[PDB]
From Swiss-Prot:
General remark: There are about 15 group 1 MUP genes and their transcripts make up about 5% of male mouse liver RNA.
Organism classification: Eukaryota, Metazoa, Chordata, Craniata, Vertebrata
Gene (name only): Mup6
Alphabetized InterPro entries for the sequence: Calycin, Lipocalin, Lipocalin_CS, Lipocln_cytosolic_FA-bd_dom, Maj_urinary
Species the sequence originates in: Mus musculus (Mouse)
SUPFAM superfamilies the UniProt entry points to: Lipocalins
Keyword Disulfide bond found: yes
Protein function: Binds pheromones that are released from drying urine of males. These pheromones affect the sexual behavior of females.
Name of this chain's protein: Major urinary protein 6
Gene3D superfamilies cross-referenced by the UniProt entry: 2.40.128.20
Positions of disulphide bridges: C64-C157
Any Pfam family: Lipocalin
Tissue: Abundant in the urine of adult male mice but absent from that of females.
Keyword Transport: yes
Domain of life: Eukaryota
Gene Ontology CC: one annotated term: cytosol
Amino acid sequence: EEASSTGRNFNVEKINGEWHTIILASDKREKIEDNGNFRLFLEQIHVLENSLVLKFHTVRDEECSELSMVADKTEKAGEYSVTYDGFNTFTIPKTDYDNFLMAHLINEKDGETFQLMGLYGREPDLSSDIKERFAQLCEEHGILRENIIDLSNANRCLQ
């Protein structure tokens, strides 16, 4: 089963649990490159009534640091907002709950705006068919293919 958070059949409770960052993409590549504030490895999603708790790890020189975020429902359906390196709003254009989840985020940091697309998997990797579907979605949002970073084999953190 597939659905979008903005759609009518979304079941947010179903995205609860462990996840992994598979691919990140942004129209501002630096944001997702080494040490970029958005090169975040998602590990867990806790579903609350009007919010989402996102648990990540950031990587700086083969060393992880746990980072938490609280995403609150905005006034738009299936949309969440969180303050982090600016003002962020995101939706989940597509997920099948038990395998992949695609998130689309828009960040505003007084002045400039940038888009981020994220592909997450219940397992540390996803099929090529899914990664391609994600790639096509990135393109529809104006994100160049060369700005899509596959972090599947990013065996980060193990100094």
